[PDB]
Design a protein around this nucleic acid. Sequence first.
RNA 1: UCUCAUGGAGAGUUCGAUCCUGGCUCAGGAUGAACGCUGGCGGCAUGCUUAACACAUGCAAGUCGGACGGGAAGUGGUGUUUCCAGUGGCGGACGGGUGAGUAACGCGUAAGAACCUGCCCUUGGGAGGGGAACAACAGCUGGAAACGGCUGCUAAUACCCCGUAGGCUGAGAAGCAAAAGGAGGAAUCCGCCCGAGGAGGGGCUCGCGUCUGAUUAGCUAGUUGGUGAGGUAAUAGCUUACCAAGGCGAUGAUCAGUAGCUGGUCCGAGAGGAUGAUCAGCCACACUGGGACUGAGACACGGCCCAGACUCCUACGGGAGGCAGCAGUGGGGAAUUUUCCGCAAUGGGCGAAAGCCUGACGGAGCAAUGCCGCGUGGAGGCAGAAGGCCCACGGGUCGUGAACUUCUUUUCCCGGAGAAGAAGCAAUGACGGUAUCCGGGGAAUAAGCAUCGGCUAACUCUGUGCCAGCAGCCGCGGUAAGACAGAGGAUGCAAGCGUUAUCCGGAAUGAUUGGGCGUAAAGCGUCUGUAGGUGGCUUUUUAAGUCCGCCGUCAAAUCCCAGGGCUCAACCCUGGACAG
Lengths: 122, 107, 86, 80
Amino acid sequence: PTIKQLIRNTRQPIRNVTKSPALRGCPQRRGTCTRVYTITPKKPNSALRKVARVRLTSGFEITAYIPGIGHNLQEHSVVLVRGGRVKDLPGVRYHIVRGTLDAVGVKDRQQGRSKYGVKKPK
Amino acid sequence: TLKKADSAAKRTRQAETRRLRNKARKSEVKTRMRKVFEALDALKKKSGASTEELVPIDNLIAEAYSAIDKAVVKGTLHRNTAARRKSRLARNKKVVEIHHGWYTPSL
Amino acid sequence: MRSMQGKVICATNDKTVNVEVVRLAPHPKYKRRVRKKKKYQAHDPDNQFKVGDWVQLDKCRPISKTKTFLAVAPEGRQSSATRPKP
Amino acid sequence: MVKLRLKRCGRKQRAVYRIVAIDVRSRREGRDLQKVGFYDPIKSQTYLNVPAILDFLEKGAQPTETVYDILKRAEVFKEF
RNA sequence: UCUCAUGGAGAGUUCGAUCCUGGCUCAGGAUGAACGCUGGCGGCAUGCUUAACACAUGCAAGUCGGACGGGAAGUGGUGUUUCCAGUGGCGGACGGGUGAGUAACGCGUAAGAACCUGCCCUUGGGAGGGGAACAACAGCUGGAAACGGCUGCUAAUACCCCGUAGGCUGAGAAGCAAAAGGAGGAAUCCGCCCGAGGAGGGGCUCGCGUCUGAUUAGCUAGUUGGUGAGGUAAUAGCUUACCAAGGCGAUGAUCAGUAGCUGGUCCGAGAGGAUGAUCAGCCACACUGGGACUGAGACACGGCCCAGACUCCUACGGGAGGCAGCAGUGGGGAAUUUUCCGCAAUGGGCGAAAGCCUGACGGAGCAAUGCCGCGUGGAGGCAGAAGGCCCACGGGUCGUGAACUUCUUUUCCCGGAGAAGAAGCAAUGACGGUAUCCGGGGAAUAAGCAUCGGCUAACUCUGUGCCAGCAGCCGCGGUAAGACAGAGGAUGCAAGCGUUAUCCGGAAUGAUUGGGCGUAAAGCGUCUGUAGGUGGCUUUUUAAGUCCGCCGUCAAAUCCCAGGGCUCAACCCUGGACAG
Ligand SMILES: [Mg+2]
Ligand SMILES: [Mg+2]
Ligand SMILES: [Mg+2]
Ligand SMILES: [Mg+2]
Ligand SMILES: [Mg+2]
Ligand SMILES: [Mg+2]
Ligand SMILES: [Mg+2]
Ligand SMILES: [Mg+2]
Ligand SMILES: [Mg+2]
Ligand SMILES: [Mg+2]
Ligand SMILES: [Mg+2]
Ligand SMILES: [Mg+2]
Ligand SMILES: [Mg+2]
Ligand SMILES: [Mg+2]
Ligand SMILES: [Mg+2]
Ligand SMILES: [Mg+2]
Ligand SMILES: [Mg+2]
Ligand SMILES: [Mg+2]
Ligand SMILES: [Mg+2]
Ligand SMILES: [Mg+2]
Ligand SMILES: [Mg+2]
Ligand SMILES: [Mg+2]
Ligand SMILES: [Mg+2]
Ligand SMILES: [Mg+2]
Ligand SMILES: [Mg+2]
Ligand SMILES: [Mg+2]
Ligand SMILES: [Mg+2]
Ligand SMILES: [Mg+2]
Ligand SMILES: [Mg+2]
Ligand SMILES: [Mg+2]
Ligand SMILES: [Mg+2]
Ligand SMILES: [Mg+2]
Ligand SMILES: [Mg+2]
Ligand SMILES: [Mg+2]
Ligand SMILES: [Mg+2]
Ligand SMILES: [Mg+2]
Ligand SMILES: [Mg+2]
Ligand SMILES: [Mg+2]
Ligand SMILES: [Mg+2]
Ligand SMILES: [Mg+2]
Ligand SMILES: [Mg+2]
Ligand SMILES: [Mg+2]
Ligand SMILES: [Mg+2]
Ligand SMILES: [Mg+2]
Ligand SMILES: [Mg+2]
Ligand SMILES: [Mg+2]
Ligand SMILES: [Mg+2]
Ligand SMILES: [Mg+2]
Ligand SMILES: [Mg+2]
Ligand SMILES: [Mg+2]
Ligand SMILES: [Mg+2]
Ligand SMILES: [Mg+2]
Ligand SMILES: [Mg+2]
Ligand SMILES: [Mg+2]
Ligand SMILES: [Mg+2]
Ligand SMILES: [Mg+2]
Ligand SMILES: [Mg+2]
Ligand SMILES: [Mg+2]
Ligand SMILES: [Mg+2]
Ligand SMILES: [Mg+2]
Ligand SMILES: [Mg+2]
Ligand SMILES: [Mg+2]
Ligand SMILES: [Mg+2]
Ligand SMILES: [Mg+2]
Ligand SMILES: [Mg+2]
Ligand SMILES: [Mg+2]
Ligand SMILES: [Mg+2]
Ligand SMILES: [Mg+2]
Ligand SMILES: [Mg+2]
Ligand SMILES: [Mg+2]
Ligand SMILES: [Mg+2]
Ligand SMILES: [Mg+2]
Ligand SMILES: [Mg+2]
Ligand SMILES: [Mg+2]
Ligand SMILES: [Mg+2]
Ligand SMILES: [Mg+2]
Ligand SMILES: [Mg+2]
Ligand SMILES: [Mg+2]
Ligand SMILES: [Mg+2]
Ligand SMILES: [Mg+2]
């Protein structure tokens, strides 16, 4: 407000806080699943969601969502995780890229296939 | 026998030999200067008349100047370093003689 | 360039003075002018200058680990001498 | 010392030089004192600004072979 | 109605509705990007951001026989000519890589005065007379090797002495100091020594500008100044002794934390925000620390010495080494290429030249990493047929779409010719028989990827039933789901299309331009007052701000304007300028 007051450095920005601290400034990271299990969604959304706990290369442990329908992942599997938030499940800030490393592609998905890591059918 | 490292080796050996030459040319100066300073102390403390004692002193001075410049042009020293060595000797020779009494510029 | 005019804060030391120079600058963002004050070790042979003096400050070779500046007689200043009143 | 030489500009396979007065120890495209000539093989484009050239040849700037012979064709060695 | 302006968009979400304050979220740009699916070509670029973590192999700095003594290849022999270790000469201080350290005169800018300077110019004088060594070589000898040891031996542009010197010391008197020859038959050339200049390259000093933290408040004793002696190429607490008690600090000292800096790049209507890859300048570093030596120049990446850590070789006694040079291997990692060709061009080093060496560089190869161009056909095509899908069974729609008929051949294929880049004597081209040009076939060889509830362009049907799943936000999904999954259809982009990460925008959401504080977050409980900020009227002075003119500079490249060149564009080149 007062000029004299601004000249004392009274305007300072709020810095940009990341939504995915565990990645540490990366598009993806690789990790190993410590556990694979289901959680119930915050009400009123009832379902059973497929989440794994993944221990990363950057050392962290997180809880990543697994997309699509059904999966082959089990403990001591090596997967690739990416960012993005599942508004349902408290604390789950990361997905698991399908079709890479140890996660296979979703079976028999015909539409938007690149999002699930599936070949084109001939 | 066939040896290939020209740059390294040859330059290393050259460095030794030249180093010893340089060492000589410097040692000379520290020496003859030192004799001069002994003569200057011995004269500053006691009472002889300079007119007399300045002769051995100036033989030593002429020597040390000779060493200085020989080492400039042989090139172990930089000339501007020389000038200071000489100016030091001159200054001491001027200091003792004011204690004793022959010369004192004032304006 | 232009030499810096100032006033003496400390005369106590020998062959030296400690000057304060005040300048105004247009602060980078907010466009208002500000007084920034800096101190200098000025070399003053003869020790002619006392505390409170208003002195012009000049540049020369290094005299010390600090004093680079020659203390110099006040350059031009408005006479505090009384003038006629027509 | 000061050298009058070519610095290589333009692109891959298509090369175009400036003729520059620069200390001999800077890089081939490095910084310089003065820009003087322009040269190019493929467009057969060549020309020089002679006042500068002479003012540098005078203070002892040495040219490089190619340049030497460019100044030859343009008759700067006669005036010298 | 002259002149300026080429620029500022919103939407959903608290409520039963409304208006507001306020956050979250979205639409746009940009990447040194990564991942998923898909992938025809060309043009110009780009390519270990993490571990300044380790390195197997090979190559990245030499050259001069016109300084010099030798011996080894030949030849018939010192007529010819080659190589070669060694001493000497210059060069290895440039070029190349990296960003760890550094909050500093390190960097940008603008000044200064006490300096240095090989090579290159310009200029003033010179080069007498002697002598002594040391490698090489020889002999003896020690070592697995690496590398040594004795005694002899020898040349020089290599060392030492003396004479002379427009220089150095000094108030002076005086004192003191230099040389080198090699070519050629001679002329002459390249050198050598001492001064005195020039330009360029370095060293210092200072104004200004140069991150976050007060839950970091006092810090500094060679510290701040003075003298005397030393030291440095030069000024200086640079050193040292003595004297004095200063210096810095709430306008943030010290301490902690992060960081190479700048031309620039990205974004913004602008004001300004974020950042510092390629490209160019400067700094700093070279396995981890410390020294110096040589030298015009180093405290020296491919030099020396020492200590340490680590790897290798060893016949066990000892040695060898430093990829953050070009490739390459392991390792870390989401992630970043060939153990390529060439000195032909430009630039360097040495050389009288011939020339030699250059992983600088010039080029190729690999990769849709990015930007730009082009293609995957063009014209006609009953309004009749198969089929998918929808349908109130009337028909609609995929759809002039295909099939089908002709034209064309960029690209593809098979043959031919075939550059500029090379510079003034010819010769000499890695790229490459590539770019381009002429012929012959033939629609022939080439379309995917997201989305379709609102923001947001694009909709129906079958399958599921709070399940399986989606989601950027609101939120969808319990029997007919425009929000899930499939189908058909549409829409958007297009050799790319999406998802994630990062930054600015929108955000007027840290507000100078551009907000607020009665009740929404927000006026100290109230005064007194120090620094600090602002402060009535009139005349004069001055000219620090302020304004106007002129000059210097703010490197080139980039951005902006005007032309020109690659068929166009990207990209390159010339010229010029507003800002500030
Ligand atoms: Mg944002
Ligand atoms: Mg000699
Ligand atoms: Mg030509
Ligand atoms: Mg409410
Ligand atoms: Mg509601
Ligand atoms: Mg608001
Ligand atoms: Mg976007
Ligand atoms: Mg592929
Ligand atoms: Mg790195
Ligand atoms: Mg090796
Ligand atoms: Mg080689
Ligand atoms: Mg020969
Ligand atoms: Mg030869
Ligand atoms: Mg010679
Ligand atoms: Mg012969
Ligand atoms: Mg040889
Ligand atoms: Mg270097
Ligand atoms: Mg370099
Ligand atoms: Mg490079
Ligand atoms: Mg500075
Ligand atoms: Mg500096
Ligand atoms: Mg500063
Ligand atoms: Mg030299
Ligand atoms: Mg002689
Ligand atoms: Mg002599
Ligand atoms: Mg001959
Ligand atoms: Mg002869
Ligand atoms: Mg910055
Ligand atoms: Mg002391
Ligand atoms: Mg750092
Ligand atoms: Mg804005
Ligand atoms: Mg890099
Ligand atoms: Mg660079
Ligand atoms: Mg290393
Ligand atoms: Mg030296
Ligand atoms: Mg260094
Ligand atoms: Mg080196
Ligand atoms: Mg190396
Ligand atoms: Mg490498
Ligand atoms: Mg690997
Ligand atoms: Mg790995
Ligand atoms: Mg090669
Ligand atoms: Mg070459
Ligand atoms: Mg060349
Ligand atoms: Mg030459
Ligand atoms: Mg290259
Ligand atoms: Mg390919
Ligand atoms: Mg391409
Ligand atoms: Mg391609
Ligand atoms: Mg890709
Ligand atoms: Mg890549
Ligand atoms: Mg058609
Ligand atoms: Mg045809
Ligand atoms: Mg030719
Ligand atoms: Mg053809
Ligand atoms: Mg719509
Ligand atoms: Mg969807
Ligand atoms: Mg998003
Ligand atoms: Mg229902
Ligand atoms: Mg049913
Ligand atoms: Mg249904
Ligand atoms: Mg129905
Ligand atoms: Mg659907
Ligand atoms: Mg479909
Ligand atoms: Mg803002
Ligand atoms: Mg305001
Ligand atoms: Mg508000
Ligand atoms: Mg309330
Ligand atoms: Mg309130
Ligand atoms: Mg109140
Ligand atoms: Mg209170
Ligand atoms: Mg008050
Ligand atoms: Mg007051
Ligand atoms: Mg006032
Ligand atoms: Mg007033
Ligand atoms: Mg510029
Ligand atoms: Mg144009
Ligand atoms: Mg054009
Ligand atoms: Mg231009
Ligand atoms: Mg200006």
